[PDB]
Amino acid sequence: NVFNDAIVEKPNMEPAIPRPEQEKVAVSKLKNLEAKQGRKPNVLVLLVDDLGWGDPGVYGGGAAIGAPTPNIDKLANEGLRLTSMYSQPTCTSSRAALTTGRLPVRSGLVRPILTGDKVTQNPWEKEVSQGKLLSKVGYKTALIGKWHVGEAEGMLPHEVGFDYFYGLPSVQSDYTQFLVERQYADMMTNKELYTKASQLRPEGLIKGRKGGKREVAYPINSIEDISMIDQVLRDESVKFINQAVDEGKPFYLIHSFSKIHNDNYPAPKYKGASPAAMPVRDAMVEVDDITGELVALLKEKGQLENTLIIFTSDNGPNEDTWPDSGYSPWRGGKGTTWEGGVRIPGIAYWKGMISAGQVNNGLMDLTDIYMTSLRLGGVIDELPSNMYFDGIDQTAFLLADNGKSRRQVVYMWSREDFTALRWLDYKIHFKVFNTAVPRRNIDASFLLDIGTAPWVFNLNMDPKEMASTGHQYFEWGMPQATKFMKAHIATMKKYPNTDIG
Amino acid sequence: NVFNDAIVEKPNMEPAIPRPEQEKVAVSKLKNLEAKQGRKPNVLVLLVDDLGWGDPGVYGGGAAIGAPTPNIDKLANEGLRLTSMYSQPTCTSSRAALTTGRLPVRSGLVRPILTGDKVTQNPWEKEVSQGKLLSKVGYKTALIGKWHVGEAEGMLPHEVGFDYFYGLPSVQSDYTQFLVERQYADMMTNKELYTKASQLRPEGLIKGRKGGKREVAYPINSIEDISMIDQVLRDESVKFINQAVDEGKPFYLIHSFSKIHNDNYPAPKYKGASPAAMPVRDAMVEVDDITGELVALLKEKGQLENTLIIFTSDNGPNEDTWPDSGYSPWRGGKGTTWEGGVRIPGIAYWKGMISAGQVNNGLMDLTDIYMTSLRLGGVIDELPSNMYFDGIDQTAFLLADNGKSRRQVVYMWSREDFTALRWLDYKIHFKVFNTAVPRRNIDASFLLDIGTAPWVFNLNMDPKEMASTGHQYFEWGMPQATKFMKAHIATMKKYPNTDIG
Amino acid sequence: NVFNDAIVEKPNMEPAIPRPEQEKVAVSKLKNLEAKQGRKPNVLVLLVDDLGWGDPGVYGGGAAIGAPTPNIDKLANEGLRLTSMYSQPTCTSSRAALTTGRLPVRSGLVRPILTGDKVTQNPWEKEVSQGKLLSKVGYKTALIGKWHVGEAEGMLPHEVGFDYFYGLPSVQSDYTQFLVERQYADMMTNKELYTKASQLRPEGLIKGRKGGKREVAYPINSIEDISMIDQVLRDESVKFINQAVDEGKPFYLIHSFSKIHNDNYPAPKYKGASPAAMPVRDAMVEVDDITGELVALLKEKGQLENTLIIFTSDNGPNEDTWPDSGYSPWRGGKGTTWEGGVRIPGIAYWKGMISAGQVNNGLMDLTDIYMTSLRLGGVIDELPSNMYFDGIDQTAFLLADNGKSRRQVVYMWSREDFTALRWLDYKIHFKVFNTAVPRRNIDASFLLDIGTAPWVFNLNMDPKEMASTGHQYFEWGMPQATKFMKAHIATMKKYPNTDIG
Amino acid sequence: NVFNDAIVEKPNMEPAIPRPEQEKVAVSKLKNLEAKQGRKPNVLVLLVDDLGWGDPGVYGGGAAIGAPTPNIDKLANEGLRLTSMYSQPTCTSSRAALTTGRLPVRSGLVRPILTGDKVTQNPWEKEVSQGKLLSKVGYKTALIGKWHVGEAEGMLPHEVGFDYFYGLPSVQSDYTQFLVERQYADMMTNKELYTKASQLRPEGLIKGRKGGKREVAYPINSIEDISMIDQVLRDESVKFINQAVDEGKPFYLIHSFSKIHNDNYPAPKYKGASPAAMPVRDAMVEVDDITGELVALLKEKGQLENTLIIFTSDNGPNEDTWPDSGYSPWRGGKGTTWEGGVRIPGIAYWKGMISAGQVNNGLMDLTDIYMTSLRLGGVIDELPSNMYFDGIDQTAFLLADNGKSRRQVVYMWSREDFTALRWLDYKIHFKVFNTAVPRRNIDASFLLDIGTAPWVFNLNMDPKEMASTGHQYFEWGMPQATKFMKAHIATMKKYPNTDIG
Ligand SMILES: [Ca+2]
Ligand SMILES: [Ca+2]
Ligand SMILES: [Ca+2]
Ligand SMILES: [Ca+2]
Ligand SMILES: [Cl-]
Ligand SMILES: [Cl-]
Ligand SMILES: [Cl-]
Ligand SMILES: [Cl-]
Ligand SMILES: [Cl-]
Ligand SMILES: [Cl-]
Ligand SMILES: [Cl-]
Ligand SMILES: [Cl-]
């Protein structure tokens, strides 16, 4: 009551903090841009896989860990670097959030659905992607790269709203487990066992158009083939941007790198390209080079001033596959709701629109990228009213100089378990991941109920979440955090979550 | 059943062990006293906040920890010292039990209900305090000091039965978080955050009479003000006792010290008064002096022979706020069902009724003080029959020389979680608190399910609960411990617990 | 499904993997044996209590831990040694599975029912023991030694199907706790407590015949008496084998040693007989000698060629009672679903039927001994169709040279909690036991929920379960492990488990 | 300079804090006593083995752990209770300190020297016991009970200065390891191994007069014999006190209980005499009764007012032998320099000399008992000048009302390793004992070097030494703590320590 600064706009939309003065600056910047450009703006989402908060140089990594990222760094120094961007703790949960504007517990997309899985419902028949909505108002929409949000009938991007799909229906490790003989020898060198397991082996990169069928476009059956995966994806993103711009149409492209998911096999060009001379760091060099190649293309096509570029990650680093892992200064990693698992890099670049040199610690969510995309295209009013949407339009936050965020709380779920939330700079845990083996967040952990008080970390003072102080310094704020929790869960009674059985 | 010595008297009352010979002695002592005194006895309950089992010198602390307690020692040495007195693990839960005869899971009083809380019904309408029942038979009843059992409309002591209330609706820490700027700087020196949080800042000590309005009798706006808090409470209890004795009516007074809850600020007189010269120890010297002043007042009024004095705590030491913490020799502390959290000091003094120099290890509960009080006033038959009462009348235990307890089992709850029980000298845990940071029982703990066998500690042999032996030496008793658990839970099916929503 | 090699025979029977060629060998071997022998075969089950996987010399113990086991080694080296035999984590549960062919969560026999518990219905009215079915087709069936699956009315072996019973209704520790004064002094030297606890003291060894009353055959009132317990049981098993062979009837005998359950008191002639010179190691030598005596009796009576001998254990070592404990190389022990508690020794010997010198790592369960017995006697078709049976006939697996197992999965329950399963050589934990005090698997453990991924151990590579790799090397098999788990739980939706209340 | 309040009197003597006014009171009390009594005072040292700080009732034990100690409580309540009394971590070391006035690293008496251990020189030829010095000025000196400071030639009390010795040359567990067959079966039931070990079996209690031979006065060949051990010792102290009073000579008697060292076998009449009904608690009752018997003897002979009674322990509880162990609230136990091992109970009773009801937290040491004894007998001026003496005369501390101690610092050694010191209420660790298994302070511990700062505990605020704060609050005092350490080590270069080889 005395703390809640959010206002309910539509009952099925996450309440947002009004920023009227920032909204006026945003509306004005977009009006003048479209006058000069003659059409709606493009959006380029560069989505790296399992990238940690600290991997880019501007976040305290780069040359400090043997993989300088000059292009990503330049994108940040000449734009807006978000230090409190949040994702979900796992691949599918985050990519679902980014393409539905909904916490995955609502949609049922907490785990990838396989081609032979028994489901009572295809969740995508009910969910609405930004490709669907933006397509209807003139955008050419595409997801190029990793999907991992369902590969059964009617679940690929070009089947759920996007005009064009090209990439991996599952994930890198699904391919490499049938390629690195020694690493997976218990299955690879066991003939009887390999005969069974290889029947569910992925074929390669899939290509698909809205209204058409799926096609194998780049088969993968060796390490040499898979080492070119991100080069091939880069080739398709270039062709997609060339085609959309040459046709004078606004485009919306999610470029979903395969890297740096394990097992990383960078292109031969990049073997030893990083000072560290390790596959995952070489892969980071390849990601930084492809990022620069796409920025250069837009600059050469004269569309850089009309393109919002978002560089982010889908979750924290996968320490379980060390040394094939990224780096994050925070506690934990992929598979936990510690900050290591969910606090991720987030860079917003828009030449002429977003002032250079900004570092902003305002709260932001992957679902906010979804909802900002919808507002940029002018289609927020097209969302269904019987579904609850967790995303918040952050246009006023991104386009204002040192603007304040419109999001008040970040809610954190481990699939169907609600575990923690962040309000202001305070991190409140109601369920805690406890790891038995160092680095083994996913594979050797417990999810434990807290005791008398939820764990509380002031992230400004204890960002690495080393020791909880609970109620000691937070008696004034604890009941409000509980109110945020209960209200959040209440929205899931008012709007039932999907059970896909 | 070869073990159960308890007998069902009224179906809605915790079964008690008959002590018929001790009861004859108690009936005779009470009869002769009322014939000589001319009216029912007074009861004075001295309730110290967050005092550990070993804080008083007579329990093994005092001078050993740099804070002598001579007056409290004299109460024990000239009366009865209980070494197996039990409370609830936290403030609100223990204070509800003391004023309702009921484990707080039955009443819903596991958390303090603040103003503006959503509740189906005010739990206190249904509950029956000893103030209500004793006031009905001519007692002047008062609670002076800390309440912390609800501050919304109709929840202060003068609105739930007591004739007079004077003290803190909430708790010391609620006041001090708005006074110690540096300790709470993230809120106090943040202008916008302070403006919001300070709107729920308590104004001071609240004064209230049955049938009247709440008044702010003593404002608290500085450390200087709050440093006198326990001197002001002492003054009010002196006025109350004087007024009741001058009217010739029996008094029932719960003097609920604010000390030694954090943040401790003793009166200026007591700065450096303890050899330790630390706030929490200086506060212990202040509590001991006030105890002696109240005893000396009763002596000067000629009411010591007709006054039962009970000195006790509401829970174990708050180790989380170290070094502003009491001391206990047992494991854990406040916020856990380790012995450190629930095994608390307990002294019964009654000049001419309770023989001096008794140390008794018989089981006793805070709810037993409630039920003992009701019997001394002759009002047990007034308890509603639709509610289960956990308290047991212990008058035959307190008034018998080296008497045996009427309580067979102590049941331990963490709010809505049943975690452990004690039977004879055996502590059986069905859920265990596990602490991740030293001293951080409340703020950095888990509540974990046990494995194949409940944990068992022979408290005579392992009082510090260092390592469980489970079934190894307790096969004969383990099935009975489970029978006690099952029956205890079954009473909550036959007598439903309150859901306040 | 590409992984599932099992086939549904009957809908209420655990699916098995067909082994047609092994089955032909089994059918032919049995037909020729019965031609020369003139009657169905005998089955002698030697069941040692709390014996670890590695206690026998052939399993890496014996002389290595100061207790040679030559006779048991002879059964293994002249027969078939199973290195992946599994039990339940505790006594009652395992013996229920051995005598009902059903995981104890289905029957309700997760705990011993005491003569004085009052249960909705006696589970043995519904459960079908191999004694009932085999006696119906001409077998003389007996259980001699430890029972521990209920001692209330109609729960002893001679009341639930077996023709003859002689042994302990409960367990060794139930007797020795009233005999070893010092070890149990808190109860033994406390007059009041002993008077109550000893009312439930077992009188001695109970004898019973189908259709007859219970009798106290061997009173136990001293260490002297109970030190001969396994010598008495040996004498009874000798009488029973002699009389079945003299009468020309096939016999089914479960010899259930009291050893090596605590507190071990071997016969005087074995004091110091082991090099280690400790009670539990002396008890091991006594067990080995008794094994050799029964085998010699078969050879003397000319029945060794027509007798399948199964040497196995009921659960892993009880480390909590150290140093009165067996040995196992695996993690944990009795009371946990770690391999230490469930992976147990398993030796099958059948002179002339099972080729000597075999070591086989195929999966096998105690319920498979039940189901294999029923097929050897030819009565599998007599099982009720409204009850699910987890046992699998392993006759083709035991009578084939280096044959493959018919069991695809072992399912592991901690009473009512499903915790893990084994498929192929992979151990997958869904709930993990965590021990807070070394050796204290039963008495100081937690049962914790896993985090993002189930814990996975390749037992060939990590047989001691030292650090889980989870999904890292098992992405191809993890969905199939989930399919097994969910299908297993589904069988208990279709066939309800017994709620004994 | 700024902090040191001690003064150097003789260069080979530990400096002491002058207490001139307390010394004036002490000289007057002793003068008036000797006028009325007619001779020098008696001293009775009651020394319990492995007794914890909290075991007596007045220290927070007794009835709270099921073993009341009324006679020991009465000594404290009617005398002076010391809450900061310190010993050494082990038996031999502490008993050396008590009978030499010197930290045992100086004398070489850190381990008991066994018959024929081949030493460079018997260390007792250099040390000067109070028996020797007091005997020269007319005292009858005796040690009755446990010795444990050397069994070789010339090492028993009657050979190193005491007039009379009667008791155990070694320790209780030296006898019982040859009496409890099952507990020590690896040796007892191994014929060849028992034959070897039993050649060093102690034959029983040894008796000796100054200038006479050793004699076997009570043979111990069974549990029956040893169960009376402390009754036999009580008889001898009675005979000794009677003989001294009838001869009119002042007596100095160290009554060294065998209890409560493992394995505890109390007299038959005490079996179950404690409420806990456990051997170690029954033994506590026997010790309390014998204490009361000796006090009543002195009163009956008319010497109570001329007898200083010291009740204390030689070290903390032996948790390794749990449940045959005492109790202490502090961390650790016997075998460590945690407070649990060295902070011991200490009571001083002197009817008419020491005012009743005192509790004093001043620093006190076992070596101070030695030096105080020498003062009372008037023989301090007879100490050699080539040995450094650590003991300090505390007569002014024990005979003053709430007097301050003459000891500034307590230095703590683990045999030859300097580990910690206490100054004021601050405990400073330079080496730390880390315990790998709960309770196993002696048997499963490491001795670790600290890191950048010595560990510091304010014992008033953290008496259980839960978490060190080091320099954080002690920068003003840490350089002084280091000065104390270095000066202490310097005394050992000026006065070299003994190398026994
Ligand atoms: Ca990912
Ligand atoms: Ca409290
Ligand atoms: Ca067993
Ligand atoms: Ca000792
Ligand atoms: Cl604004
Ligand atoms: Cl290349
Ligand atoms: Cl009675
Ligand atoms: Cl003041
Ligand atoms: Cl086959
Ligand atoms: Cl024998
Ligand atoms: Cl002085
Ligand atoms: Cl006796």
Question: What span, in angstroms and rounded, lies between the C-alpha atoms of D145 and D240?
Answer: 13
Of the candidates B54, B276, B361, the beta carbon closest to that of D460 is on B276
Radius of gyration of chain C, Cα coordinates, nearest whole angstrom: 22
Q: How many secondary structure helices (H) and strands (E) does chain B include?
A: 16, 17
Please give the method by which this entry was determined.
X-ray
Amino acid identity for residue C488 in this structure = H
Our CA-based measurement puts residue C200 at a distance from the nearest CA of chain B, in whole angstroms, of 8
First to last CA, chain C: 39
- Give the contacts of B155 (CB within 8 A, at least 6 positions apart): B113, B122, B124, B149
What is the three-class DSSP state of D427?
strand
Nearest ligand, CA of residue A316? 1
Closest CA to A341 of A265, A448, A413, A438: A413
Instruction: Suggest the residue from A194, A318, A443 to mutate for an interface test with chain C (most C CBs closer than 10 A).
Output: A443
Strands C204-209 and C215-219: antiparallel
Nearest CA in chain C to D323: C183
Q: Which chains touch B (3 or more CB pairs under 8 A)?
A: A, C, D
Strands C80-86 and C364-365: parallel
| Residue B460 sits at the chain C interface (C-beta within 8 Å) | yes
Is the separation of the CB atoms in B397 and B362 below 8 Å? yes
Question: What span, in angstroms and rounded, lies between the C-alpha atoms of B276 and B284?
Answer: 11
| Residue B464 sits at the chain D interface (C-beta within 8 Å) | yes
Question: What span, in angstroms and rounded, lies between the C-alpha atoms of D406 and C310?
Answer: 77
Q: Which chains touch A (3 or more CB pairs under 8 A)?
A: B, C
Nearest CA in chain D to B278: D461
Question: What span, in angstroms and rounded, lies between the C-alpha atoms of A235 and C457?
Answer: 41
**Three-state SS sequence of B89-154:** CCHHHHHHHHHHCCCHHHHCCCCCCCCCCCCCCCHHHHCCCHHHHHHCCCCEEEEEEECCCCCCCC
Amino acid identity for residue A292 in this structure = G
Question: What span, in angstroms and rounded, lies between the C-alpha atoms of C149 and C97?
Answer: 10
* CA of D226 relative to ligand 12 center, distance in Å: 11
| Residue C7 sits at the chain B interface (C-beta within 8 Å) | no
- Give the contacts of D476 (CB within 8 A, at least 6 positions apart): none
Cα C109 to Cα C47, C119, C132, C500, D268: the distances in Å are 19, 12, 18, 9, 45
| Long-range contact set of residues B233-236: C-beta below 8 Å, sequence gap at least 24 | B233/B144, B233/B145, B233/B166, B233/B167, B233/B205, B233/B257, B233/B258, B234/B290, B234/B293, B234/B294, B236/B144, B236/B166, B236/B167
Instruction: Suggest the residue from A435, A472, A486, A493 to mutate for an interface test with chain B (most B CBs closer than 10 A).
Output: A472
| Residue C486 sits at the chain A interface (C-beta within 8 Å) | no
* CA of C151 relative to ligand 3 center, distance in Å: 17
Chain C residues touching residue D190 (CB < 8 angstroms): 272, 277
How distant is the alpha carbon of residue C242 from its chain centre?
A: 25
Helix axis angle, C91-100 relative to C366-377, nearest 10°?
Answer: 20
Amino acid identity for residue C112 in this structure = P
Output b/e per residue, D298-334; b: 16+ Cβ within 10 A: beeeebbebbbbbbbbbbbbbbbbbbbbbbbbbbbbb
Nearest CA in chain B to A425: B186
Our CA-based measurement puts residue B57 at a distance from the nearest CA of chain D, in whole angstroms, of 8
* CA of C330 relative to ligand 3 center, distance in Å: 17
Asked if A183 lies within 8 A of C451 by C-beta distance, the reply is no
Cβ burial, residue A288 (10 Å; 0-12/13-18/19+): buried
- 3+ Cβ–Cβ pairs closer than 8 Å linking C and D: yes
Which token pair is C152? 């209330």
Our CA-based measurement puts residue D82 at a distance from the nearest CA of chain B, in whole angstroms, of 9
| Residue B181 sits at the chain A interface (C-beta within 8 Å) | no
Is the separation of the CB atoms in C429 and C455 below 8 Å? yes
DSSP string, B37-61: HSSPPEEEEEEETT--TT-SGGGT-
Chain A residues touching residue C461 (CB < 8 angstroms): 186
Cα A277 to Cα A53, A183, C366: the distances in Å are 21, 20, 54
Asked if D272 lies within 8 A of C187 by C-beta distance, the reply is no
What is the three-class DSSP state of C166?
strand
Strands B140-146 and B164-168: parallel
* CA of C25 relative to ligand 9 center, distance in Å: 9
Cα D466 to Cα B332, D330, D457, D474: the distances in Å are 11, 10, 9, 17
Is the separation of the CB atoms in D47 and D313 below 8 Å? yes
- Give the contacts of B243 (CB within 8 A, at least 6 positions apart): B140
E-only strand ranges, C225-306: 251-256
Q: What angle do CA A463, A465, A470 make, to 5 degrees?
A: 115
- Give the contacts of B18 (CB within 8 A, at least 6 positions apart): B5, B7, B406
Give the up-direction half-sphere exposure of residue A392: CA atoms within 13 A in the CB hemisphere.
Answer: 24
Main-chain phi, psi angles of C365, to 5 degrees = -125, 160
Question: What span, in angstroms and rounded, lies between the C-alpha atoms of C433 and C449?
Answer: 9
- Give the contacts of B449 (CB within 8 A, at least 6 positions apart): B431, C446, C447, C448
Question: What span, in angstroms and rounded, lies between the C-alpha atoms of A262 and A443?
Answer: 15
Cα B48 to Cα B258, B311, B316, B442, C318: the distances in Å are 7, 8, 10, 19, 46
- Give the contacts of B391 (CB within 8 A, at least 6 positions apart): B14, B97, B101, B102, B365, B367, B368, B369, B370, B371, B372
* CA of C7 relative to ligand 9 center, distance in Å: 14
Which token pair is D474? 């002690």
Nearest CA in chain A to B263: A472
Strands A251-256 and C409-414: unpaired
Is the separation of the CB atoms in B41 and B376 below 8 Å? yes
Question: What span, in angstroms and rounded, lies between the C-alpha atoms of C7 and D135?
Answer: 95
Question: What span, in angstroms and rounded, lies between the C-alpha atoms of C272 and C281?
Answer: 9
Chain C residues touching residue B475 (CB < 8 angstroms): 173-174, 177
Main-chain phi, psi angles of A490, to 5 degrees = -65, -40
Question: What span, in angstroms and rounded, lies between the C-alpha atoms of B9 and B15?
Answer: 7
Cα B114 to Cα A1, A472, B148, B314, D169: the distances in Å are 13, 19, 10, 20, 70
Is the separation of the CB atoms in D500 and D119 below 8 Å? yes
Is the separation of the CB atoms in B60 and B54 below 8 Å? yes
- 3+ Cβ–Cβ pairs closer than 8 Å linking D and A: no
Residues around the ion ligand 2 (C-beta < 5 A): B 49-50, 91, 314-315
Nearest CA in chain C to A335: C452
- Give the contacts of B196 (CB within 8 A, at least 6 positions apart): A2, A3
Chain D residues touching residue B347 (CB < 8 angstroms): none
Question: What span, in angstroms and rounded, lies between the C-alpha atoms of D94 and D90?
Answer: 6
| Residue B329 sits at the chain D interface (C-beta within 8 Å) | yes
Question: What span, in angstroms and rounded, lies between the C-alpha atoms of D187 and D195?
Answer: 9
| Bridge partner list, B236 | none
Asked if A448 lies within 8 A of B445 by C-beta distance, the reply is no
Of the candidates A1, A467, A471, the beta carbon closest to that of B442 is on A471
| Residue B414 sits at the chain A interface (C-beta within 8 Å) | yes
Closest CA to D148 of D202, D105, D199, D196: D202
Q: H-type helices in C303-404, by residue range?
A: 339-342, 366-377, 395-398
- Give the contacts of D204 (CB within 8 A, at least 6 positions apart): D216, D217, D218, D219, D220, D221, D225
Is the separation of the CB atoms in A423 and A481 below 8 Å? yes
Nearest CA in chain D to B439: D466
DSSP string, B308-330: EEEEEESSS--GGGTTS----SS
Q: Is D161 left (phi over 0), alpha (psi -120 to 50) or beta?
A: left
Question: What span, in angstroms and rounded, lies between the C-alpha atoms of A250 and A142?
Answer: 12
| Residue D279 sits at the chain C interface (C-beta within 8 Å) | yes
Q: Find tokens 């006697």 and name the residue.
A: C377
Which token pair is D185? 């079966």
Chain D residues touching residue B58 (CB < 8 angstroms): 58
Asked if A455 lies within 8 A of B443 by C-beta distance, the reply is yes
Nearest CA in chain C to D276: C186
Superfamily of domain C20-413: Alkaline Phosphatase, subunit A (3.40.720.10)
Closest CA to B101 of B125, B76, B129: B129
Output b/e per residue, D372-397; b: 16+ Cβ within 10 A: bbbbbbebbeebeeebbbbbbbbbbb
